[PDB]
Design a protein around this ligand. Structure first.
Ligand SMILES: [Cl-]
Lengths: 195, 198
């Protein structure tokens, strides 16, 4: 995978198909429902010019593949506006699948977990202390706004041992911290995929 | 106290079925069965039928013998690509007032450290499964469901642990564990052991 191919895959991996959206629901409802797994980068909502409304589906785009993966595993069939929404991976890809597979394989070489819904008051050291209860930590870093320096509600933690990362995901996904429920999952891409 | 025997039974039945949509026109009952059987033996499948075009309407309802199988299928078969399309899996939209009983059952289930195990190779026995799983902690019981006529196990069972951490460790370590040639499908129970008893 050339740096360009890998980047193309990462973008596809960051989006999820969302279908069976109740006609009365809009972008804001969707955003609110999918934001817990990472901050939404954008949403492409279907739209019909004659009827003046969406076609019942949308593509939610996240800043990282791990957020889309968690949303995929936790938002499927959730009831919104009286309907059980459907969540899936984009059907397009077109030949991006082998790169995606390669990234998933490369990710297994790291004991990295993705953490979302991290309360604003928590700091890197705070998250680190909490999570090092499951094992020794190589690094714990919260993504930050390049301008402000405030964290964006999510981060990555790398453990020395696989058992530690497995124990952490199992114990911390949906763990109530600071008033919100953390959304935790195993990484689906290696740390510096384009290196 | 939520639900009499009849109400609970009605909920259990709904809990044992999953909606399967976006099925490629060329695919039929057999392909769906083969795709969903890993989570437990399929009891039946209600496939949509158009007739005028003599084709299914692209969706079906797979029914399992137990709610835990439908739960695992729901978590693992969603968006899987079949016939070139990413199938959709969800819970029946019907229910109609069954939701509160289902919630009650899920709550009662948490009082047990019970896990569901599917795709158990025929050669394994109860003591076999038990030894393997007791590596995660002390086991109260390990039982494989059986054909009432033959006595042969039906490829799935339940295991109760003395401690919750044990059951949690087991699900985490054994789901998708390659045993006897197939991959075990493991999950936490969604209903209490004898849901229909007093
Ligand atoms: Cl049972």
């Amino acid at each position: 995978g050339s740096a360009a191919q890998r980047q193309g895959a990462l973008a596809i991996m960051s989006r999820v198909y969302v279908g069976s959206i109740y006609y009365e629901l809009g972008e804001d409802t969707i955003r609110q429902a999918f934001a817990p797994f990472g901050p939404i980068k954008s949403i492409d909502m279907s739209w019909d010019s004659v009827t003046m409304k969406h076609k019942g589906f949308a593509f939610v785009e996240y800043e990282v593949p791990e957020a889309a993966q968690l949303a995929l595993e936790q938002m499927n069939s959730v009831m919104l506006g009286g309907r059980n929404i459907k969540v899936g991976r984009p059907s397009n890809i077109g030949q991006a699948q082998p790169i995606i597979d390669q990234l998933a394989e490369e990710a297994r070489a790291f004991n990295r977990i993705y953490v979302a819904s991290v309360h604003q008051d928590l700091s890197d050291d705070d998250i680190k202390s909490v999570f090092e209860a499951f094992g020794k930590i190589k690094s714990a870093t919260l993504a930050r706004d390049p301008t402000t320096g405030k964290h964006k509600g999510y981060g990555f933690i790398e453990y020395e041992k696989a058992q530690s990362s497995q124990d952490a995901v199992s114990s911390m996904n949906l763990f109530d911290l600071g008033g919100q429920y953390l959304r935790v999952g195993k990484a689906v891409t290696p740390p510096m995929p384009l290196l």
